Amino acid sequence: SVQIVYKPVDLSKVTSKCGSLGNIHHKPGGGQVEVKSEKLDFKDRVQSKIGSLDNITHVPGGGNKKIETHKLTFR
Amino acid sequence: SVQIVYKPVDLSKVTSKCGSLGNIHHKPGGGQVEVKSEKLDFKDRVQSKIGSLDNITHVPGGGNKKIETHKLTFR
Amino acid sequence: SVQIVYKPVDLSKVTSKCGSLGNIHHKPGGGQVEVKSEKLDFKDRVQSKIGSLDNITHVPGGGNKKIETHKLTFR
Amino acid sequence: SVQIVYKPVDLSKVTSKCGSLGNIHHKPGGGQVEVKSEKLDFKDRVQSKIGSLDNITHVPGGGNKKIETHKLTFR
Amino acid sequence: SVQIVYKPVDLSKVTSKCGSLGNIHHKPGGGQVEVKSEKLDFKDRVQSKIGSLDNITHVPGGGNKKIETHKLTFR
Amino acid sequence: SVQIVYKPVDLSKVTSKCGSLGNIHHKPGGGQVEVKSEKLDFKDRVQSKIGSLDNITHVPGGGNKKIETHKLTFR
Amino acid sequence: SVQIVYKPVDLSKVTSKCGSLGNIHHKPGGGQVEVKSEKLDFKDRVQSKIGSLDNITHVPGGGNKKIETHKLTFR
Amino acid sequence: SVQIVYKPVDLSKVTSKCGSLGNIHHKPGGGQVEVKSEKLDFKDRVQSKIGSLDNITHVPGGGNKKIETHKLTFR
Amino acid sequence: SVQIVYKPVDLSKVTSKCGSLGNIHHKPGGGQVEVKSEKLDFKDRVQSKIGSLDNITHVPGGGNKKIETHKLTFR
Amino acid sequence: SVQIVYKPVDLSKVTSKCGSLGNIHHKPGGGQVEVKSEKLDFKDRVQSKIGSLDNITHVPGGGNKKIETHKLTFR
């Protein structure tokens, strides 16, 4: 006799009031990357960037991340 | 006889009032990266950046992160 | 007979009033990175940046992080 | 017979009134990093930056971190 | 017969009134770092920066950190 | 009665023995030039470079400059 | 009665024996130049570089400059 | 009656024996120059560099400068 | 009756024996120059560098400067 | 009756025996120069460096300077 009463009430007013974004000027200059290898070995679970020269402008009008994880385990 | 009454009440007014973003000027100059290896070996769970020259401008109108983790375990 | 009455009441007025962001000028100059290795070996759980030359401008209109972890365990 | 009455009431007016951010000027000059290794071995749980030359400007309109951890354990 | 009546009432007016941020000028000059190793071995739980030349300007309109940890254990 | 006997004897063994030029590697990195004016006025004899970002590699197998000026004047 | 006997004998063994030039590696990093003016006025004889960011590698196998000036004047 | 017997004998063994130039490595780092003016006025004979950020590698296999000036004047 | 017998005999064994130049490593770090003016006025004969940030490596296999000036004047 | 017998005999064995130049390592660090003026006025004969931040490595395999000046004047 195991009885679980699971009642989460989530009330979130996750909200942004954001006016004008204005003037945004991005001038990334030029660079040089020189990288040398011979053998690469890797097995299972890999996120890798090798010699990545990049410009990333991620401007969202609202950045809202809500993460809820619920784990219930009986062995 | 195990009885669990799980009643979280979450009331969050996560909210931002943000006016004009104004003038943002980003001029990243140019650099040089020289890196040398021969053999790389790695096995399981890897996030790696090697020789990464980059410019990242992450401007959100609102940055709101809400993380809730609920774990209930009976062995 | 184990009985758990779990009643958290979370009332958070996490809120920012932020006016104009004004003038932001970022000029990162150019540098030089020289790094040399031969063999790298690593096994399980790795976040690594090697020779990373980068410019990161993270300006959110509001920076709000709410983290709640609830763990209930009966062995 | 173990009975737990868990009633946290959290009322937080975590709030910032912040006017104009004004003029912010960042000019990072250029430097030189030279680092040499031969073999690196490490096993489990690693966050590492090696030879990282970088500029980070993290200006949030509001910096609010609320962390609550609740652990209840019966063996 | 163990009975726990857990009633924290947290009322926090964590609040900042902050006017104009004014003129902030940061000019980090250029330096030189030379570091040499041959073999690095480390096992479990490591946060390490090796040869990290960097400029970090973290200006939040409000810096508010609220940390509450509640641990209840019956063996 | 003005009599000029002008007898220059120029014997120059201007000579270079130069072997192999070897390996020459030029990597000019990227820079940024910002220059502002409104009105420029200049009159006669002008060699001017304004805002000139350039790479010049002038490698001659032999650099020999012989300049002879002979001026004879009777008023 | 003015009589000029002008007899220069120039014997110059201007000569270089230069072997192999070897390995020459030039990595100029990236810089930033910001210069502001409004009105420039200049009249006659001007060699000027304004805001010139440049890399110049002038490697001659032989650098030989011979300059002879002969001026004879009767008023 | 003015008589000039002008007999210079110039015997110069201006000579260099120079072996291998070896390994030359030049890494100029990145800098920042900020200069401001409003009005510039200058008249006649001007060699000027304003805000010039530059790298100059002048390696000649032989550097030989011979300068001879001969002036003869009767008023 | 003015008679000039001008007989210079110049015998110069200006000579260098120079072996291998070896390993030359130049890493100039990054600096910052800020200079402000409003009006500049100058007239005749000017060599001027203003706000010049530069790296100059002048390595000649032989540095030989021979300067001879001969002036003969009758008024 | 003025008679000039001008007979200089110059025998110079200006000579250098110089072996290997060896290892030369130059790492100039980064500095900061801030200089302010308003009006500059200067007239005739000027060599001037203002706010000049620079690195100069002048290594000649032989440094030989021979300067001879001969002036003969009859008024």
Ligand SMILES: O=C(O[C@@H]1Cc2c(O)cc(O)cc2O[C@@H]1c1cc(O)c(O)c(O)c1)c1cc(O)c(O)c(O)c1
């Ligand atoms: O804000 C910058 O000024 C803009 C240009 C400018 C000029 O040339 C001469 C002058 O008398 C005034 C002037 O005001 C301009 C301006 C731009 C705006 O976005 C703004 O909101 C403002 O009030 C006024 C700016 C932006 C730039 O991107 C830039 O590179 C820079 O050097 C300057």
Ligand SMILES: O=C(O[C@@H]1Cc2c(O)cc(O)cc2O[C@@H]1c1cc(O)c(O)c(O)c1)c1cc(O)c(O)c(O)c1
């Ligand atoms: O704020 C900077 O001034 C802008 C340009 C400028 C000028 O050229 C001459 C002058 O008399 C005034 C002047 O005001 C300009 C300006 C820009 C603005 O965004 C702003 O809000 C303001 O009030 C007024 C600025 C921005 C820049 O990006 C920059 O590189 C710089 O050097 C300066």
Ligand SMILES: O=C(O[C@@H]1Cc2c(O)cc(O)cc2O[C@@H]1c1cc(O)c(O)c(O)c1)c1cc(O)c(O)c(O)c1
């Ligand atoms: O605040 C800086 O002044 C701006 C330029 C400028 C000028 O050129 C000459 C002058 O008489 C006044 C003057 O005021 C300008 C200005 C910019 C502003 O953003 C601002 O709010 C202001 O009141 C007034 C500034 C910004 C810069 O980015 C910069 O590099 C610098 O050197 C200066």
Ligand SMILES: O=C(O[C@@H]1Cc2c(O)cc(O)cc2O[C@@H]1c1cc(O)c(O)c(O)c1)c1cc(O)c(O)c(O)c1
């Ligand atoms: O605050 C700086 O002055 C700005 C430029 C400037 C000038 O050139 C000549 C002068 O008579 C006055 C003058 O006031 C300018 C100014 C800028 C402002 O942001 C501001 O609020 C102000 O009241 C007035 C400043 C900023 C800079 O970034 C900088 O590098 C510097 O040297 C100075």
Ligand SMILES: O=C(O[C@@H]1Cc2c(O)cc(O)cc2O[C@@H]1c1cc(O)c(O)c(O)c1)c1cc(O)c(O)c(O)c1
């Ligand atoms: O506060 C600095 O003065 C600014 C420039 C300046 C000048 O050039 C000549 C002068 O007669 C006055 C003068 O006032 C300027 C100024 C800037 C301000 O931000 C400010 O609030 C103010 O009242 C007045 C300053 C900032 C700088 O960044 C700096 O490097 C410096 O040397 C000085």
Ligand SMILES: O=C(O[C@@H]1Cc2c(O)cc(O)cc2O[C@@H]1c1cc(O)c(O)c(O)c1)c1cc(O)c(O)c(O)c1
């Ligand atoms: O001289 C450089 O070495 C070259 C590359 C290299 C290497 O990768 C690993 C190694 O065990 C030896 C090695 O010898 C190479 C080499 C190049 C030559 O031109 C050379 O005359 C020589 O004897 C031998 C060099 C040049 C480069 O351009 C460079 O960027 C660098 O880092 C190094």
Ligand SMILES: O=C(O[C@@H]1Cc2c(O)cc(O)cc2O[C@@H]1c1cc(O)c(O)c(O)c1)c1cc(O)c(O)c(O)c1
């Ligand atoms: O001289 C450079 O080495 C070349 C490449 C190389 C390599 O990859 C691995 C290695 O074991 C040896 C190696 O010798 C190469 C080489 C190139 C030559 O021109 C040369 O005369 C020589 O002897 C030998 C060089 C040139 C490059 O352009 C360069 O960018 C660099 O990093 C290096």
Ligand SMILES: O=C(O[C@@H]1Cc2c(O)cc(O)cc2O[C@@H]1c1cc(O)c(O)c(O)c1)c1cc(O)c(O)c(O)c1
């Ligand atoms: O002379 C540099 O070494 C080269 C590379 C290298 C290496 O990687 C590992 C190693 O065990 C030895 C090694 O000898 C290389 C080498 C290059 C030559 O040009 C050379 O004449 C020589 O004898 C031998 C050099 C050049 C570079 O350009 C450089 O950036 C650097 O860090 C080093």
Ligand SMILES: O=C(O[C@@H]1Cc2c(O)cc(O)cc2O[C@@H]1c1cc(O)c(O)c(O)c1)c1cc(O)c(O)c(O)c1
């Ligand atoms: O002379 C430098 O060593 C080179 C590289 C190197 C190394 O990596 C590990 C090692 O056991 C030995 C070693 O000898 C290399 C080397 C390069 C030569 O040019 C050379 O004549 C020599 O005898 C031998 C050098 C050059 C560089 O440019 C540099 O930046 C540096 O840190 C060092």
Ligand SMILES: O=C(O[C@@H]1Cc2c(O)cc(O)cc2O[C@@H]1c1cc(O)c(O)c(O)c1)c1cc(O)c(O)c(O)c1
């Ligand atoms: O002379 C430097 O040593 C080189 C590198 C090196 C090393 O890494 C580990 C080691 O056991 C020995 C070692 O000998 C290298 C070396 C370089 C030569 O040019 C050389 O003639 C020599 O005999 C031997 C040097 C040069 C550098 O440029 C430098 O920055 C530095 O820190 C050192």
